[PDB]
Amino acid sequence: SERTFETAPSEIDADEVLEILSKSKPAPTHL
Amino acid sequence: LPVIAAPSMWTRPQIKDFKEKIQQDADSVITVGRGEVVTVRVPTHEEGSYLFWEFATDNYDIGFGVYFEWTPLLDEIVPVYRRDCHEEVYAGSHQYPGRGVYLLKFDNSYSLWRSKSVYYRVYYTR
């Protein structure tokens, strides 16, 4: 079973990025 | 030949605040079914430089990965693997390699009996 649809990306500010990443720690990308 | 930038990925435990902020829109929630795989197409913004994404689930893990579609030519950005995004919020980023379409794969093909509720946001930076 499969599905697909499109979603427009919203603009993210610098302070938005900082707000998120200030709480976050690195995670594995490629395992 | 065009080189692809490595992506970055993070995790944060503030998962309740995330969902609660997401649920305030319907177009930000997905219900991946049993054995189903949902692909979210995210076109590169004409005035953008990076992709940024967030996602999380309820109660169960899910397969996540990212591909880049050229414009059917594909580049593997984030290999598909199961993430414990029911315990934490997974965020990530990737520099636009060009004009095209990112393919965010929410893979629940391995689950026989459990549907996965998916909260997510996709962005771009100027």
Ligand SMILES: OC[C@H]1O[C@@H](O)[C@H](O)[C@@H](O)[C@@H]1O
């Ligand atoms: O219940 C344990 C496992 O069952 C599977 O169906 C779920 O998709 C997994 O997220 C879970 O780790």
